[PDB]
Amino acid sequence: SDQALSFLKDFLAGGVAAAISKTAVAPIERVKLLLQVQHASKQISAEKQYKGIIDCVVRIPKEQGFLSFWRGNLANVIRYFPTQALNFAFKDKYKQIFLGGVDRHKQFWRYFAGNLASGGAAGATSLCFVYPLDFARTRLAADVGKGAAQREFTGLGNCITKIFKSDGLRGLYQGFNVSVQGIIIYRAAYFGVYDTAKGMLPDPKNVHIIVSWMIAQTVTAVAGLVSYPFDTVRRRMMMQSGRKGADIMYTGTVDCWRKIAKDEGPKAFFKGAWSNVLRGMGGAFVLVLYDEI
Ligand SMILES: C=C1[C@@H]2CC[C@H]3[C@]4(C)C[C@H](O[C@H]5O[C@H](CO)[C@@H](OS(=O)(=O)O)[C@H](OS(=O)(=O)O)[C@H]5OC(=O)CC(C)C)CC(C(=O)O)(C(=O)O)[C@H]4CC[C@]3(C2)[C@H]1O
Numbered sequence: 001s002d003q004a005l006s007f008l009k010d011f012l013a014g015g016v017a018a019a020i021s022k023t024a025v026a027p028i029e030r031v032k033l034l035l036q037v038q039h040a041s042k043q044i045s046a047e048k049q050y051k052g053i054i055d056c057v058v059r060i061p062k063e064q065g066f067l068s069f070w071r072g073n074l075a076n077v078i079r080y081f082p083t084q085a086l087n088f089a090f091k092d093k094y095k096q097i098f099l100g101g102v103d104r105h106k107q108f109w110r111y112f113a114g115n116l117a118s119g120g121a122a123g124a125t126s127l128c129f130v131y132p133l134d135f136a137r138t139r140l141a142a143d144v145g146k147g148a149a150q151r152e153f154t155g156l157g158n159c160i161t162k163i164f165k166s167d168g169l170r171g172l173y174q175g176f177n178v179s180v181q182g183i184i185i186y187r188a189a190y191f192g193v194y195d196t197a198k199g200m201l202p203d204p205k206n207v208h209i210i211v212s213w214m215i216a217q218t219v220t221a222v223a224g225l226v227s228y229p230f231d232t233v234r235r236r237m238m239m240q241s242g243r244k245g246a247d248i249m250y251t252g253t254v255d256c257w258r259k260i261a262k263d264e265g266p267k268a269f270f271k272g273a274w275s276n277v278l279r280g281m282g283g284a285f286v287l288v289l290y291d292e293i
Contacts, residue, residue, distance in 0.1 A: 015080040021286040022076040025279045027069035029076075031056045032275030033141040037235045039264060039271065040249050043144045043152075053275055064146050072140030074156050075133040082133075086126045094121045115191065116184050123183040131179075132172045136160055138238045152242075163242045171241030175234035178253045182230030190223035217284055221277045228276065229269035233257055 022029075031053050038044045050056040060068055098114040098121070127134075136159040145151035153159035163171040197219065201207065207215075233256040240250055250256045260268050 011081075011084065015084070017287060017290055018080040019077040020290055021283040023070070023073055024286045025282045026073040026076065027057070028053075028275060028282060029279045030069055030071060030141045031060075032272040032279055033072075033138060033235065034144070034272075035275060036232060036272035037138070037142050037239055038144075039268065040236050040239050041142060041144065042243065042247055043150075048144070064144065071143060072137045072156075075137035075140075078156075079130050079133045079137075082130050083126050086129060087122065090125050091122045094118045094125075097121075112188075112191065116187055119187045120180065120184045124180050127176065127179065131176060132160060134179075135163075135172050135174070135238050135241070138235055139163075139241075142239065166242045166244070174241050175237040175253075178230050178237070178256075179234040182227045182234060185227035185230055186223050189226040190219065193219050193222050213284075213288075217281050220280055220284070224276060224280060225270075225273060228273050229257075231276075232269045232271065233260065236260070 034050060034056060035052070038049050050059065057069075064071075095118050098118040099111065102110050102114055104111045133156075136153075136156045139159050140153060140156065143152050148154060153162055160172065197215070201215070233253060236256050237250060237253065240248060250259055264271075
């Protein structure tokens, strides 16, 4: 060996691992979505909206079947491979266009900005292609329907083809913009918090290693909380595609930040935020157990 098809078995493993953690936490990921976008559903009346996580998981199995926890999951397992291909293709290029020729230690802010753009551009590129999967994934999760007769979509494939035959690609991509704003916010917080933090803590390796994990998670959760409102409006807009007239609670991104803060208050933006913290730590934790011989 020295060129034994090495580069791709990682790819397979990397995707197989991704599939496993996503599927493991798919149940809580669905509860977080429901709580997040239920207030804007055609199915969930006001007298069906869940009181929280427990209320939700205690009711879902009975309402739609135990397997419904995995409703919309398929897209989670797919997305990995197509996304990854696109990174091998642009991520590096973006790094050099924006971070090229700048020394992180002698230009902190020019590195902060360049790195945002670097991640912002790449994210926008990948989204551009797999966004639809996130769309379907989110639409299906919100499908609180019971039988295939009280179900908005009979699946991912249908969900895609349906909305399209209803709004072309425009429907399938609602929330795009704000999700791109969100990504930059996520990244600014992720790093912003890791820089201030790297100093407030002992970097001489002296800090067990497991404590190092819990802090990485801590940082992933903080970053995820700061950009959560953006995720919230993003999802709320996805909900609209296909809903021709009447119920249209939102018309545009601004129309969304608007209605919410008004009708739902200053926090509706964080509906599912805690659930999303659990989903994230749970996932990172699954990747831990996964590393078995
Ligand atoms: C408005 C919002 C909220 C805040 C920002 C994003 C993410 C958290 C942002 C995030 O993940 C991004 O952040 C990572 C941390 O800095 C960055 O890694 S890094 O380069 O190694 O630093 C990831 O890049 S990648 O190159 O590895 O692939 C990047 O992924 C993308 O660009 C994924 C595309 C599918 C978009 C990805 C993701 C996740 O972690 O849950 C994912 O979908 O998998 C998004 C969920 C959707 C929201 C939630 C978007 O709705």
